[PDB]
Amino acid sequence: MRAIWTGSIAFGLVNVPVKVYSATADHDIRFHQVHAKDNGRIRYKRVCEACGEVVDYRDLARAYESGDGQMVAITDDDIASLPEERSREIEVLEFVPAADVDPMMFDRSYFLEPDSKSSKSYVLLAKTLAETDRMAIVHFTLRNKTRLAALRVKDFGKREVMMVHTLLWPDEIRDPDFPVLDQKVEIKPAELKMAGQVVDSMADDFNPDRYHDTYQEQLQELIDTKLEG
Amino acid sequence: MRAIWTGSIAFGLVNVPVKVYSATADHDIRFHQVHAKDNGRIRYKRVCEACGEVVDYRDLARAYESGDGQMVAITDDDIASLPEERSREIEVLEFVPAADVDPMMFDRSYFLEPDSKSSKSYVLLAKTLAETDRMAIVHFTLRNKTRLAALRVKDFGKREVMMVHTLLWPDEIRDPDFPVLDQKVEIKPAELKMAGQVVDSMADDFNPDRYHDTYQEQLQELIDTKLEGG
Amino acid sequence: MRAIWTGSIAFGLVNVPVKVYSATADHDIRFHQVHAKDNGRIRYKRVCEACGEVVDYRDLARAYESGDGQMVAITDDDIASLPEERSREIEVLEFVPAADVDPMMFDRSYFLEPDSKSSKSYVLLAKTLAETDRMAIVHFTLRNKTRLAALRVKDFGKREVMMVHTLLWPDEIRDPDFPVLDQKVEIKPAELKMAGQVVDSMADDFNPDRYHDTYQEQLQELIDTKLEG
Amino acid sequence: MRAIWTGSIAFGLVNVPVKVYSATADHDIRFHQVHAKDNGRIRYKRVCEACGEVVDYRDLARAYESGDGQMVAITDDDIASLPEERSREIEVLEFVPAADVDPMMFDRSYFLEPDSKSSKSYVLLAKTLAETDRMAIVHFTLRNKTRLAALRVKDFGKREVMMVHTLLWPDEIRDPDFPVLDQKVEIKPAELKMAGQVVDSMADDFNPDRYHDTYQEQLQELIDTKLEGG
Amino acid sequence: MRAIWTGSIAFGLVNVPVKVYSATADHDIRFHQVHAKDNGRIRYKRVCEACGEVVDYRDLARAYESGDGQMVAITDDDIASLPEERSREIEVLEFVPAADVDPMMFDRSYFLEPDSKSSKSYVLLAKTLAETDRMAIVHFTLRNKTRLAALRVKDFGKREVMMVHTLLWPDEIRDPDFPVLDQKVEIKPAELKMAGQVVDSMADDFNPDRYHDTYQEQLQELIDTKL
Amino acid sequence: MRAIWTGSIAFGLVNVPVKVYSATADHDIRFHQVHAKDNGRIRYKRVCEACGEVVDYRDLARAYESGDGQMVAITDDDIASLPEERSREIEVLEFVPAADVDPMMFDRSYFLEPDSKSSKSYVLLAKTLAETDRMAIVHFTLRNKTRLAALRVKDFGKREVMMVHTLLWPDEIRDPDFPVLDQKVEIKPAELKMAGQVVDSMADDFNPDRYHDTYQEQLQELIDTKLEG
DNA sequence: GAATGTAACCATCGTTGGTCGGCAGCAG
DNA sequence: CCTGCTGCCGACCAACGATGGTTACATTCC
DNA sequence: GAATGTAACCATCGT
DNA sequence: CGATGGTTACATTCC
């Protein structure tokens, strides 16, 4: 496990040096694109539509099109005009109860390890957040773009570990405009009664090891068959 | 809104025909490269390293490389040997308490709209899930790839809408192997109490329309002033 | 075979779309009356007693009669007041044992064909009904006049088909009030055995091909010979 | 209770005098039409669409319409040629186990009483059919039509009555031509196990008093309040 | 221009990552022993002057001898029981008034440079210290020795810089026992008036550019002729 | 309790003879390394390892690399050029209020005692400086060294004793002018109340008997138990 | 809109590179 | 009854090298 | 195009 | 000798 960000959680007088680790890793098998016959590697070569000429990366300019107003042709100077902020701060804004952030906001997950040997500041914040059950909304800038994020603490056995959840911006969520649910449908009490045993017949507790990506497992063994064959 | 999936939630007798809508959009501005001197669109041409010959898509083949073992080509026919997953039904596995699933599992969210002539099965299924405060661990297959997912219900004002959250497989979560937290630090109640005033001074309820993507807003308005000028 | 009803079996979570087919069709011949001297079809003309003139269907009102009363005028306005639903759902009430419904209750028979992309719900419901040997009591609603009905599964060889039997209401069966059977008559076992032997002498299994409508066949052959001249 | 048909049971050397009653009587309210302005009963007038004149019943004949086979006139000697069907005897043919006759077979039901002061023959026949559970397939003619019928014994407390069930001929029963049920599906034991509780949760015992024609009772109260309302 | 020690100031949940700089560097010319004829640096040899045995490093342990206790040896296992004091944080103990700390205790001074541009905590801590006018007594460890230190902010033009002064332990200051002052000596009130006029005669404000060192200035003049 | 330097204060019309005692002595235990088997005193040998010349104490000549290794030699002529500094008295330059001087140049402290039975001169000098709240800046001439020093008065209990502080030369103070300090960020008023509360929470009074060199104190105990054992 | 690649650049760990230290000799 | 002055030697900061990993983006499939 | 209603007749059990 | 319920066959708002 390698870190991807060495910064600090800062709000006012407070500053907690931490290192960010990616909490999740896609276990899907990733392939490569090769020529069918000679099995050589495949490279992508740019070609301008106007002249059919291969162009280098240095000759590219970002463009924006909106329905009709195509070819805005944004230059790199205009980006420099933007107040770019490649900050190294997890800037805490507020502290909200953990129940006020619903699951559809969460985007990604990251771990927080105390970077320095002085972990007292890290422990105190984690202990305070866990005891009072609050979550901190922060401005987390991973590499070049800033994203809304939430600071939460969860226990991995005997270890109290802080964690960062990238959040979707509130305007990024659509609203269900379905008129079907507006009308009222009458449900007899017996049907509500029946819906009980159906749920409790299949009801259980979340056991992680029951669920296995079957398609990936058989894909892995098929590859191993070719590897030995 | 345009649906992305038309099927049903089936776990036996129960079969609720629903349509899936993408709940979350993305407001980020998406650009596309153009030739600087020509302002012409850029196309990608595939070139094979072995011969330099331009390779059409039909003349491609997936390959997998991992340390020892080179040119491990996976042909199309082997994928056919794998049991295909074209399922158009959201197969329900079991029902778990809403709190038993951890927030780090969710990655994507979708809406469920009833599709049959009568929505009684959908409406009443939502009613019991909220009353029992339970989730539903399901198998969801959007486009030829099955993903573990969770079925839950949210209240959007007056409407009660079922919702699908795709989940990461339990083996996708790493363990925080940090020996630093293992060592124990001595603390006093004075600083422990003092941390209360620091946190509670900034404590507030989650207000959605207080956080804005300022960078996108500035970027968006810069586009228009360039668009009008020429 | 043409469908006479398209709906679904619904009792809560479960909703199995099906098509209803008439399981029995009488094989009689429907004769038409014609003029003796003209061979022309006759159309009945509605003649009112108090008017003596032909009255159209628009000017027709239903009346009820009971003893002293007689002219209880009923118009469709009161019919609208009375709840009347053409619900396209075969609502299920319970699952009684199969043997608990006496054959005197059955009135008509219908077939159920699955009418969905997947017939898993239909097939699995049929499988559990047969293995537990139970019968579902439903509220089958044809074109108005909701009727009590029973749902059962019968094997037509290699196909397992669900069927709907319309039932008369339990209050619709008369009471076999016979004073003669109330009194008892002495009978000796000696001649009881003789009655047993004659009964089993004629015993035979059910062969449906053994019985045919002989009179109707003679009627059948009569009018085709006349038709062919 | 009024007798519909009086006769006997044909057996060769055994005769069982008997009177027939209708086991069921529809309780639906029967309406008859009146003038919308005069409240007068309408009497149908038979007018043929070839002369515009009323026709006495002596001047019509039954005709068979079948495709191009029109103008088929059936006179008095045509239907007299068929043998007379009016018979006052219930001709038994065979004796079949009660489980062999299907529920789909039954059409109507009737009651039988001993139409004499000597009921020994009746109670004798019911006894053999009771202990040796069998059904007697008979030819039953009510007024002028001969229908297949099944004879069984049913008990009302301490009373044993033979009941005659009119059976439609086996050639009037259709065959389900559904290719959908021919194909087989993959089903899991978990799905079958789920079907148990849902069936068993709604499982009960057949109680006749639990079901009432709710529409009829609501309809029934409508006339009387109008009758009592003037 | 080099950070002798990089860490943070922590007094609980607060933590201010800083880098220290030596605030004072002596400008006196320092020499090293050189050979008049050989013109080569002299390297000392670890030779025991009791038996002639030539000794090398990584083989000799510390010793402590005084009065009655002689040849009391200390090895590398005895100091292992001593807890390591190599903590890389400046642990703030209290915040005493900035004026009550006696100038007797200061020996060395240091400069605190902020961390990367994430430096709001430093300016915040400096701002409050100047406002209520207090200094923080801390435990400062440079390499391995933990010394009592006082944290104080002070004004440098338009720049607010926090300085880590180091204090001698309170037990290192001797008690002045001067019996010559035990007797009470009467002071003439007229002399106090006489002294009052005397003190303002030479009352001159401190001008750092008024007085320079003379020994150092003269020595470099002779070096100019040689070079 | 041994005097280190005896002299007088040069004032013109005033001259107070005085003995000087060092105020503070470092209490860290000094260790001398000896042989593991011989326990001898390792006396370093000054033999130049460039030509094998055994340089004597008088043979040594201090050299400085300076700019480009110009290790110029110094003989008795040079020290003759500099004025003799064997004077055993110190002189006063100016009187500055104590508030003007700041403590980053203070390094050492020494006591002073009246050397004559006429102690009235000593106390009179002490009285006026305390009344004037000023510190006299002097040149202190220690063993073959002249340093800038600053008298001062301090009351130890009921005893009145003058004190000499030698100051580091003003030219020896570096300039910490960094652009980061020049760069100013925006401070909200919100955390100022929180920052002040945090500092005031841990505010206390300077009681010198609260801090001991616990590392050094308990090492003596280890030595005490090692010597006893 | 969804998966599925490629191709930029950035970032954290690695490890060779000079100071400034804290620990000891000598001056009648 | 002390104190100035240096190498036996030693932990402290930058400049490129490898390796993940993020971000952006076209190309297929509706 | 069946299912649903309703009137028409004659057979028929009850005196 | 008088009434009831059985087959007739007809006009409807239909998946």
Numbering used by the authors:
A (entry chain A), C (entry chain E), F (entry chain C): 1 to 229
B (entry chain B), D (entry chain F): 1 to 230
E (entry chain D): 1 to 227
What does the paper say about this structure?
This filament is continuous with a minimal repeating unit of two Ku-Mtb homodimers bound to one DNA duplex, in agreement with our EMSA experiments indicating a stable complex of four Ku protomers with 1 DNA duplex. The central DNA binding cradle of Ku-Mtb threads on to DNA, in a similar manner to human Ku70/80. Neighbouring repeating units position the two DNA ends at a distance of ~40 Å apart. We observe direct Ku-Ku protein interfaces within the filament, which is formed by two α-helices and two intertwined loops forming a largely hydrophobic interface. Interestingly, within the DNA filament cryo-EM map, no density was observed for the C-terminal α-helix, as identified within the apo structure. Instead, it appears that the C-terminal helix has been displaced by either the action of DNA binding or the binding of Ku-Mtb at the filament interface.
The NHEJ mechanism in bacteria is a simplified system compared to the human counterpart, as it is reliant on the action of only two proteins: Ku and Ligase D (LigD).
